[PDB]
């Protein structure tokens, strides 16, 4: 934009933080893509869209860097409402907030529609996948990207490290995002 009250909801950022901070491997961030509905102006249409729900960023040229700092100051001024580097993973995390996915489309829409876990481990997996969100993340330094369908949306995890599908992490996501 300009340009681009329940339990499970008051507790969302806490559950995202808990996922990241309480995890076996080193994850860079977690994003929750939420279910929203669009209604078409021409017809009666309930279309499922996955939008930005919330996120938790943990973490671990000069031309590009000052482009980034401008945006952050511009955003700062708009939101409220002494300067150091804006890293690639931070930037990817930031820009992710403007992204949306029609159900079935893109890594999260894919994941939700099929009630699926998509686990892309290693740079080869990310780029070889041919999905642009995976390619984007790989560009920005992520070596692992995960989407886990939950009852209210999709949990996205990413890391600049290579991480194989852990059976334990699956249980974590279920405990925290179902029900």
């Amino acid at each position: 934009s300009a340009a681009a009250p329940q339990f499970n909801e008051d507790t969302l950022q806490q559950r995202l933080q808990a996922l990241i901070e309480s995890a076996g491997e080193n994850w860079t961030y977690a994003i929750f893509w939420q279910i929203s509905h669009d209604f078409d102006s021409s017809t009666g249409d309930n279309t499922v869209i996955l939008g930005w729900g919330d996120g938790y960023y943990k973490g671990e040229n000069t031309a590009e860097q000052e482009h980034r700092k401008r945006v952050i100051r511009e955003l700062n001024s708009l939101i409220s409402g002494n300067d150091e580097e804006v890293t690639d993973t931070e930037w990817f995390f930031l820009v992710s907030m403007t992204q949306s996915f029609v159900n079935g489309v893109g890594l999260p829409g894919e994941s939700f529609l099929n009630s699926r876990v998509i686990w892309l481990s290693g740079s080869g997996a990310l780029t070889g996948s041919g999905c642009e969100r995976a390619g984007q993340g790989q560009i920005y330094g992520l070596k692992t990207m995960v989407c886990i369908a939950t009852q209210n949306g999709v949990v996205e995890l990413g890391s600049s490290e290579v991480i194989s599908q852990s059976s334990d992490l699956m249980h974590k996501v279920n405990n925290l995002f179902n029900f």
Partner: peptide
């Protein structure tokens, strides 16, 4: 609404940065 969730997560993102000075 999605723009609100955006504004909230962004505010928290900024705060965490503003907090490394502090």
């Amino acid at each position: 609404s999605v723009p609100q969730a955006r504004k909230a997560s962004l505010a928290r993102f900024l705060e965490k940065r503003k907090e490394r000075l502090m």
